[PDB]
A paper describes a structure:
B3GNT2 is in the largest mammalian glycosyltransferase family, GT31, but little is known about the structure, substrate recognition, or catalysis by family members. Here we report the structures of human B3GNT2 in complex with UDP:Mg2+ and in complex with both UDP:Mg2+ and a glycan acceptor, lacto-N-neotetraose.
Unlabeled B3GNT2:UDP:Mg2+ crystallized in a different space group and was solved at 2.04 Å resolution.
Residue numbers in the entry:
A (entry chain A): 57 to 72, 91 to 392
B (entry chain B): 56 to 75, 90 to 170, 173 to 397
Write the structure that this text describes.
């Protein structure tokens, strides 16, 4: 498998370019058997795997001027204006209660015209100027570039928010019980809090070989099993681990699934993420969707629409 | 026995002397319906809201484009949309919904309110910025819901009569369909004066009935509506003359609002003595699968349902040279 072989090469190089080679890696079309018959997203991933020095087009350099207790980092796409606004008004509110600063950033790439995306750049600039919470990098925002979104976000944390006590990274289609998370973080002993990483962790998972699935991975790309990883909509970790995570990203090749890439970085650090039952990545039962007390005892639910996020958050306040 | 049918019968008696509280601007709750409609308390909330406020339709225009038709348009594009649908509207602006010219084509998006009381995110400042930039937003001060779409129809027809009465033709459609606007212009220019005067074409269905399955999107209880629907064009868009648009609005006062907007339009057409015409170019159920990847499939149709914003821009881009390939 290509990724396995290339990761083995990377280990040798770091125990005596893959970071700023941004020309097409034309060799992959010869080393990967059946390359021409692969879907375009795999072609783009393999051809441009070795480039990750993308620039920040929209920054919020003063987002963490005061040391945050919790940084909310939400992955989003340019046209998702309603999702971002509902998060701003509901569980993603910035706050300062009890000297525990909560700050919010949305993580965006480019939706370029070459991919037939509508030009929403002026709307995005208006949103950025109004809400001061948009981080946007100059790369093609795609599913297979989400591990790139992860690395560039971790880079931003190291340069612009290195002192945040904890980090929540999640999707813009989940409801998050931020009160439950804050109570959980404040209940942690210093021992568990230093290297906290929790979520919906699955062990001994493998790459999907069914070509019809969303997260299909060919045998020529990756072989073997996945490391333990938290996926399904969000995970929570300490700022200390965020710095260790970013430092190790150079030593791990990007992977088409961002949550698997994060698990690889944790495994290279010698850490095992812990499953927490409050991460309901497969939603809750049907009858309980409109029972607010079913949201009291969990961290997040996947998935909810913008209107539902505001409605649940409103009822949650009482 | 059905509520809408009985109330429409009362309305017919008022407007037709041969058959021998306002229904247009009473905007308090019609508290009588909770006793006259059997099982009212067990109806879904959208039916309760529909029945309680049926007699109100004098809603105000919050965002207007009063000079949209300062030059006599040949074709007015009116697209139904919701506040958060920024990507759909922008893709339409860049592709098939471009305004163009001596055949003026103009574009408006038809919006209601997505109020905070209904837990909608506050996107009002974004919408105002969008309106100031593109000048194609029409927004009325009513609750924008599926069962209020016939209100969107009535209020749009009112705007045509007051602000765009001289447009030669009107296309009303959804913000999730691709429209071959070139094909529509060629079709309109091929019309005789006789056929063009009362043009109304689309995906017309005859002898359709209300869905009684409580789980379906367009479910209608037996206590609300009985019998069959009139012939009506639905499924994503229809095309008609501006002369007929004025006749359509004039008759709206004589027809009670209905929870399905396209059925309401068919009711108005039937009251005028007109029958909408089926046109094969309205592909409301999409095209075949392999044909989706052939731009030649799009050169000889009016619209396709449905397409995403990127797909709209991609198809429109390939259509500009389809005359060389097809
Ligand atoms: C289509 O759009 C219509 C216009 O937006 C919608 O009509 C609105 O419907 C809402 C309910 O969804 C009504 O709001 C309710 O009003 C009643 C009565 O409030 C009045 O009386 C109370 C005291 O009893 C007083 O405090 C208020 O100031 C009012 O004078 C309340 O009891 C409810 O709690 C709720 O506020 C709107 O009044 C009504 N607006 C108008 C202009 O008619 C309609 O619902 C939409 N239809 C569909 C199918 O979605
Ligand atoms: C992840 O994001 C990166 C950066 O946006 C993407 O790399 C870019 O990929 C496009 C193709 O999708 C490249 O454009 C192409 O360049 C070749 C050069 O021969 C040309 O033949 C094509 O017509 C097209 O212009 C672009 O150069 C490249 N940018 C950089 C800086 O490398 C990448 O595709 C994204 N990956 C995934 C899996 O989506
Ligand atoms: O190209 C993309 C696709 C998705 N996302 C974000 O990734 C998260 C999860 O996406 P999705 O719900 O489609 O994936 P799934 O739940 O099926 O794993 C959402 O916040 C999206 O906005 C993104 O940032 N870029
Ligand atoms: O409350 C609403 C709901 C829908 N729409 C518009 O109605 C059109 C068709 O709606 P949809 O595709 O969701 O329904 P369909 O009849 O295709 O199942 C679209 O342009 C929507 O933006 C609207 O204007 N207000
Ligand atoms: C990254 O580095 C390479 C050279 O190492 C350079 O050519 C490229 O422009 C840089 N930036 C981007 C956006 O790739
Ligand atoms: C409609 O008209 C009635 C009486 O003229 C008025 O009471 C009502 O408020 C109006 N509805 C509006 C402006 O929404
Ligand atoms: Mg999701
Ligand atoms: Mg539709």
């Amino acid at each position: 498998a290509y990724w396995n072989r290339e990761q083995e090469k990377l280990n040798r190089q770091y125990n005596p370019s893959h970071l700023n080679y941004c020309e097409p890696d034309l060799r992959v079309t010869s080393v990967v058997t059946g390359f021409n018959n692969l879907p375009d997203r795999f072609k783009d991933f393999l051809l441009y795997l070795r480039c990750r020095n993308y620039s920040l087009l929209i920054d919020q350099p003063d987002k963490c001027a005061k040391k945050p207790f919790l940084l909310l980092a939400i992955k989003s796409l340019t046209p998702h204006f309603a999702r971002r606004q509902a998060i701003r008004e509901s569980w993603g509110q910035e706050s300062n209660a009890g000297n525990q600063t909560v700050v919010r950033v949305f993580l965006l790439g480019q939706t370029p015209p070459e991919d037939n995306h509508p030009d929403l750049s002026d709307m995005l600039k208006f949103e950025s100027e109004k809400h001061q919470d948009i981080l946007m990098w100059n790369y093609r925002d795609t599913f297979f570039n989400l591990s790139l979104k992860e690395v560039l976000f971790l880079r931003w944390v190291s340069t612009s928010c290195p002192d945040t006590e904890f980090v929540f990274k999640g999707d813009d289609d989940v409801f998050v019980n931020t009160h439950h998370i804050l109570n959980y973080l404040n209940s942690l002993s210093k021992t568990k809090a230093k290297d906290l990483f929790i979520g919906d962790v699955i062990h001994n998972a493998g790459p999907h070989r069914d070509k019809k699935l969303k997260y299909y991975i060919p045998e020529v790309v990756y072989s073997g099993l996945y490391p333990p990883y938290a996926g399904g909509g969000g995970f929570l970790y300490s700022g200390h681990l965020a710095l260790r995570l970013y430092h190790i990203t150079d030593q791990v090749h990007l992977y088409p699934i961002d949550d698997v890439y994060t698990g690889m970085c944790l495994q290279k650090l010698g850490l095992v993420p812990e499953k927490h039952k409050g991460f309901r990545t497969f939603d809750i039962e049907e009858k309980n969707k409109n029972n607010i007390c079913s949201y009291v005892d969990l961290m997040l639910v996947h998935s909810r629409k913008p209107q539902e996020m505001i409605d649940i958050w409103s009822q949650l306040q009482s």
